[PDB]
Structure formats: C-alpha cells, structure tokens
Amino acid sequence: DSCDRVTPPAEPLDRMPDPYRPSYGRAETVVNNYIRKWQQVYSHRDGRKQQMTEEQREWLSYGCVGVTWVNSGQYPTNRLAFASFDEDRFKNELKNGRPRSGETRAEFEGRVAKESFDEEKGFQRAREVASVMNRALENAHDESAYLDNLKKELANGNDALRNEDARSPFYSALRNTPSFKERNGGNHDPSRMKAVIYSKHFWSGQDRSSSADKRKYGDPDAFRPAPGTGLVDMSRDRNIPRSPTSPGEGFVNFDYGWFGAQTEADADKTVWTHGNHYHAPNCSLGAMHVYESKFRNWSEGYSDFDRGAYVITFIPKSWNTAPDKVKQGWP
Ligand SMILES: [Cl-]
C-alpha cells in the first residue's frame, strides 16, 4: 500500500537542520530535518556526537512512540506511571453535579472523570519522584545502596511510595531497565544512570466485553491513580483506541511525549517531543513530522484521549537524549 511506513534515509552527521520556530507554543519539522537536529544535539555518547543508526531511524518512523523509543533505547513499557486525580472533585460532581444538555449518565461520568485529572500535578509528581530517584543513585554504586538511599528520602518525606512492595514497578524500575545491566550502560552501578520521564496519552475504555458506552464515552473507573502514591496501573492498557460516535470521526490509540530530564523550574516552559503519525511519505497521510511542544501544548491533548500517564524510566548518564536544557526549533 502506498501508505506503508517508510524508514527515513541516513542523514550525514555533519548535515545541519533547516531553521524553524514554535508557533503558539509548538514547533514542528519533517522527520528528515528532525534527524539532523537530533544528531547535532542529542546523539552524544560520552560527549561524542553520532549518526542516528538505521535501526533508530526505523524506530523513529513509527511516530510519536518512535521519539521515546529512540531516546530511551526501549519500546515504552509504561510500567512506572503517575497521575494526579481529584477524588473529592469527582465524587462531588457525580453526587451534586448536573449532566450537560443531552448528556447521558455514561457520557457525564466519562467526562467528569476525564476532567478530574490534573496533568500539571501529574507531571510535577513524576518529576519530583524522578529527582528523589536521581538523588538516590547519585552516589550509590550498587542497587542495595540505591534502595537504602531511596527509602531514606521517601521515609523522610513521609511519602506513600515508601510502602511499595520490593517487587513493585516502582522499586524494581531501575534494575528492570535493560541498559542498567549492560557493561556499556550502567554496569549494575546506579550512579551511572539517570531517571527520565515521558508521557502517554491514551483512552480509558479499552475493554471489548464492557458496555459500548464505556468504549465510546470512557470508563470512569479505569486508570485512576492510587490516591496515596499517585501510581497508575497501566497493566490494562492494550493500545486500543476510543470507539467512534460521530459519522466521520476516527481516533488513534495513543500519543507519546518525551520530556527527558530538563532542569527548567517552570513546568510550563518544559519541551515535550512527540509527533503527528508514522512516516507515510508515499501517501496523503504524509511524511512524519516531529512536534516540540511546551508542556501546556502537550497536556491539552486531543478528543482521542481521556487519560494521561507520566512515566519514569532510566537511561545511562553517558547518553545525551535527556539534556538539562531542550530548545524548540532551530537554531
Ligand atoms: Cl523518507
């Protein structure tokens, strides 16, 4: 089919990207140009810039998932994920609120649940937790010290995460990162790793054997964070999209936005890299374009999605795909 995915060609390591700038919070560029930028600013290994490999271009060509895939070295598991949900707002709205004109019960419940998430607070929580984890490895040369350090700070902050099982997504995140266990990567040395964040936007009602109503309008009970830790159980995420209502509407299953480990104190100024869709240059769907959005442009989302997870994982310190400072556009 002419809409078949294409792997973009190799870009010479010295090829400079074309200029582009954000418009109302979002910069974008065709994937070929993004590869050029990536090579210049994110490719470094031990401070040495590198060409994006044929394999990485293949990954990248899958779309927004591909940005995160390349940057972390791994197809996203989303196993360790946070969100902020206002349980009080939700239950009150259900009890005392009145459905908007025409809304059925299921529509209303779906909406009130979508609206009771706060993506800024969800990101803030992931970021805070990531920094604890980063402090915990800073001078830990074995996992054992890392877990000690981590527990100390969580106990000192009287954090709900302090109570997670030893086998939980949270405590097992580090040792379950492939690159932690490479001699080239972390070499079982926590201090040679870095916590990194990305976000997934996705649909709550993915279960084939619940109501049509949930598939269409959202499942208010699905992907609610644990109120204490803020952890989201992503185990029931099956990459299934919202089912349509309106005649010509279609929905995609997800969006993925890469944050990395930017130091910027203002969450709103953080840059999130995602994209439109997989690379389809031979068809009217068109080439993949990469988007670099300020947080609020990211967090705004789309009708396709009523859920957002802020995921933590790890990469080797020696990489440079999560630098302290990320710029939208070029130069
Ligand atoms: Cl191409």
Swiss-Prot record:
Catalytic activity, as annotated: L-glutaminyl-[protein] + L-lysyl-[protein] = [protein]-L-lysyl-N(6)-5-L-glutamyl-[protein] + NH4(+)
Function description: Catalyzes the cross-linking of proteins and the conjugation of polyamines to proteins.
Biotech and industrial use: Sold under the name Activa TG by Ajinomoto. It has the ability to cross-link protein molecules present in food without the use of salt or binders. Used to improve some of the physical properties such as firmness, elasticity and moisture retention of food such as meat, poultry and seafood.
Single annotated GO MF: protein-glutamine gamma-glutamyltransferase activity
Keywords: Acyltransferase, Signal, Transferase, Zymogen
Family: Belongs to the bacterial TGase family.
Organism: Streptomyces mobaraensis (Streptoverticillium mobaraense)
Enzyme Commission identifier(s): 2.3.2.13
Catalytic-site annotation from UniProt: C64, D255, H274
Residues of the full protein shown: 77 to 407 of 407
Domain of life (superkingdom): Bacteria
Name of this protein: Protein-glutamine gamma-glutamyltransferase
Biased composition (Basic and acidic residues): 1-18, 210-222
Region annotation (Disordered) ranges: 206-246
